[PDB]
Structure 1
């Protein structure tokens, strides 16, 4: 996250870290056994870390749970990042408490101008590299589809939206991928892509979760 703030310990209780020997992507806990992330975060041998604030220190609230299966969206296109969404099932159920809690899926798509909360452990610089150990947060509005398509001509599908600041300076970034965009207390987006981080006229692009709710519900009910 570039230009954001320190969330504060366990104030984003649905945020997870995906760990393959190191943190590599974020995700969101949607119930006690399932995490949503980005398909471009796929790898084998994922461990899901819940209840994290400082990813480099054991603080006492964490639950570390191996993934039993990963399900990438059947229409995911790694070239265009269309349908950049994946489900991860945990080998055993998480214990839900005040520090580890699920986020609701949307019944409805969010509106342009809605302020959302984006979070993660990704790079905090627009130029250069500095990774935080504690969870960072950013509030950002959803942009109109026309300003989104203007920013990334020919690259925005109906399964994507833009959120951020056309002036630049504030954005998600590498390492935030897979993480939550929460608007009005529902998961509306997944950190997906963008051109650099926090660049002028290049806002963040997010998977539009409201398009996937049927697939998520059907998949969880059969796996």
Structure 2
């Protein structure tokens, strides 16, 4: 996160860190045994780390649970980044409490202008990687502004959020993490040209398009 602020320990209780020897992506806890992340975060040997603030220090609220299964969206295209979403099932159910909690899925999509909270352990410079969780409040941008910023690249499964002036954005290492708006998971950190650059806002997977797939996948897995 570039141009954000220190969230505060465990104030974003649905935020997880995906670890394969080191933090490599964010994700969002959506029930006791499932995490949503970006498809481009797929790899084997994932340990999900819940209850994290400082990802380099054991502070006492963590739960470390290995993934039992990953499910990349059937239509994910790694060239265009369309359908950049993946589900991860935990080998055991997380113990839910005030510091480790699921985030609600949307029942309707969010509109341009809505303020959201974006969070992660990604780069803070447009190189410096933080140990504690960083946060950014940012608005969803209009579809037209998003398409104007990235001609020919924005599909109906993507939205832009942030600040066209630059200076405030998600970044490398934030990928897969949450965009939460009024208590609903509306986005997943997906892509963008550099970070916090003028006229290059962050691009996010549009979660509301995937709720039926998420629910039916969980129901059968």
Q: Given the two structures, how large is their TM-score scaled by the length of structure 1?
A: 0.99
C-alpha deviation, 1:206, in angstroms: 0.1
Kindly provide the CA deviation profile for residues 149-193 of structure 1, in whole angstroms up to 9, marking residues without a partner as x. 000000000000000000000000000000000001000000000
Q: How does 1:181-220 map to 2 (within 5 A)?
A: 181-220=179-218
5+ residue gaps, structure 2: none
- d(CA) in 2 for partners of 1:145, 1:222: 34
C-alpha deviation, 1:21, in angstroms: 0.4
Detail structure 1 runs of 4+ shifted over 4 Å in the superposition: none
C-alpha deviation, 1:58, in angstroms: 0.0
Q: Given the two structures, how large is their TM-score scaled by the length of structure 2?
A: 1.00
Query: What secondary structure sits across from 1:169 in the alignment?
Result: coil
Kindly provide the CA deviation profile for residues 6-44 of structure 1, in whole angstroms up to 9, marking residues without a partner as x. 000000000000000000000000000000000000000
- d(CA) in 2 for partners of 1:60, 1:145: 42
- d(CA) in 1 for partners of 2:216, 2:140: 28
Query: What secondary structure sits across from 1:219 in the alignment?
Result: helix
Does residue 134 of structure 1 match 2:113?
no
Q: How many residues align?
A: 221
C-alpha deviation, 1:122, in angstroms: 0.1
- d(CA) in 2 for partners of 1:39, 1:170: 24
Query: What secondary structure sits across from 2:205 in the alignment?
Result: strand
Query: What secondary structure sits across from 1:212 in the alignment?
Result: helix
**Backbone CA RMSD of aligned residues:** 0.5
Query: What secondary structure sits across from 1:76 in the alignment?
Result: coil
Query: What secondary structure sits across from 1:110 in the alignment?
Result: coil
Kindly provide the CA deviation profile for residues 127-170 of structure 1, in whole angstroms up to 9, marking residues without a partner as x. x6000000000000000000000000000000000000000000
Query: What secondary structure sits across from 1:149 in the alignment?
Result: helix
Query: What secondary structure sits across from 2:204 in the alignment?
Result: strand
- d(CA) in 1 for partners of 2:166, 2:76: 28
Query: What secondary structure sits across from 2:187 in the alignment?
Result: strand
Kindly provide the CA deviation profile for residues 55-81 of structure 1, in whole angstroms up to 9, marking residues without a partner as x. 000001000000000000000000000
